[PDB]
Amino acid sequence: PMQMAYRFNGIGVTQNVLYENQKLIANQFNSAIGKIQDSLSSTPSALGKLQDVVNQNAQALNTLVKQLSSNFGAISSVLNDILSRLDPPEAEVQIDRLITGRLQSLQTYVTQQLIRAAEIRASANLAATKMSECVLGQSKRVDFCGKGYHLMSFPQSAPHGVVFLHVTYVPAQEKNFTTAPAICHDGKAHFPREGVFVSNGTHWFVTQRNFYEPQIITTDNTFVSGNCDVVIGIVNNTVYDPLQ
């Protein structure tokens, strides 16, 4: 729970959020993991990216094998029978055509295998980067480890591949609020140290950016800089110091 709290702290939500609703977060995480099981068991073509490599390699091998049925202009496609029914000086010319056709077929196969191997190497390099940056760390780099703010991810091995379970924080029910970028007090202009200013309509609060937590504005969560004459959107409000 403390590790996940600091991962929350790594996306801009204070730790107190996770601790005040840890039961809810754990329940919601367990539900989200359980839904992966059902989604994979119920939705076909989910593993398509992995099945396609198998399919393409099988198809390339099948066409390579079926190229042995081709004559390429030889009297017959089986080398044994042309060899067993032509004398060498007339069988060499027939065998040469098969040699040329089969060699050039093998060359085509090997070239396409090289290109596909380069593509798979690119994918494996991407998977290595994703392991390092999503599993071994927390990635501040958007949409690299899933939709939402990345918390943590889990690897799962798959046949000839890897599957990543990306746990992300997604914001939910939100409210239209009124704002201002600073407040004016005794001619001093106060900016928020962290978060934004919001009004419930009659009273003004500072909240953090990703979770509504109004606090009364104090000298301890804002900082003064300049006077009220410079910033274009200012609101007059009172700021309290505990010292008084």
Binding site: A46, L98, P159
Partner: protein, 253 residues
């Protein structure tokens, strides 16, 4: 000689040339003997034929697409910007794209409203304007923890072909003829060996990123967090997690 359609042309040939030819050495026009008229040549229409199918597991119904032809040369025919598409009823209302036709047109088996393969202009998503103001913000009052799955291929099968017996088999006779081609098969063996050896490096680089094997504690006191769905199961013969077991039961070779 050649084949095509002949039409009148406005290309002012010179009195001595007999036939015109466009870029890339193709006859584009010829002049007529016996009338000296200058007639243009256009290839007569052709193109591929493609078959739209929901799947034999759903219906035997099919739409056919002739790729680059006007609907003037052979139940309901629709002229679209990617060819002539026959067998698909065209719906004004837009849906999410299911089977791509091209040029923004897709087609799918509806199964509810029309019992046919409809054709439509694909939609890009739900429309919503954001309530922008100079003094208003939207801040979330809750959150949802969401887990998404991402699938990446790492390696492929390490195949290896032996030229001498793929091309010849057990025939010294043609092996002697194959020797005349030099190192064509030292090369192919070398290339395939390179592919096969790097397939293992792919897996090593993706997975071998920990120097020591970490073990989970016997007691699972994770503060309400439940991982039984991802940790290996002792009851299994092969010590895989439930999700990995489903993944292994899901791809077929």
């Amino acid at each position: 000689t050649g084949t095509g359609v002949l039409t009148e042309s406005n290309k002012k040939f010179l009195p001595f040339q007999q036939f015109g030819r466009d870029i890339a050495d193709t006859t584009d026009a010829v002049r007529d003997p016996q009338t000296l008229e200058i007639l243009d040549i256009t290839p007569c229409s052709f193109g591929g034929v493609s078959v739209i199918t929901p799947g034999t597991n759903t219906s035997n119904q099919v739409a056919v697409l002739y790729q680059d032809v006007n609907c003037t040369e052979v139940s309901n025919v629709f002229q679209t910007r990617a060819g002539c598409l026959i067998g698909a009823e065209h719906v004004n209302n837009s849906y999410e794209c299911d089977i791509p036709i091209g040029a923004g047109i897709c087609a799918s088996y509806q199964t509810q409203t029309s019992q046919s393969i409809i054709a439509y202009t694909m939609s890009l998503g739900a429309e919503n304007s954001v309530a922008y103001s100079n003094n208003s913000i939207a801040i979330p009052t809750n959150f949802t923890i969401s887990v998404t799955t991402e699938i990446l291929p790492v390696s492929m099968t390490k195949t290896s072909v032996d030229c001498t017996m793929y091309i010849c088999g057990d025939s010294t006779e043609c092996s002697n003829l194959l020797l005349q081609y030099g190192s064509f098969c030292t090369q192919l063996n070398r290339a395939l060996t390179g592919i096969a050896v790097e397939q293992d490096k792919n897996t090593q680089e993706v997975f071998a990123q920990v120097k020591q094997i970490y073990k989970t504690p016997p007691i699972k006191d994770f503060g309400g967090f439940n991982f039984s769905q991802i940790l290996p199961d002792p009851s299994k013969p092969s010590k895989r997690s439930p999700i990995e077991d489903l993944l292994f039961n899901k791809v077929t070779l």
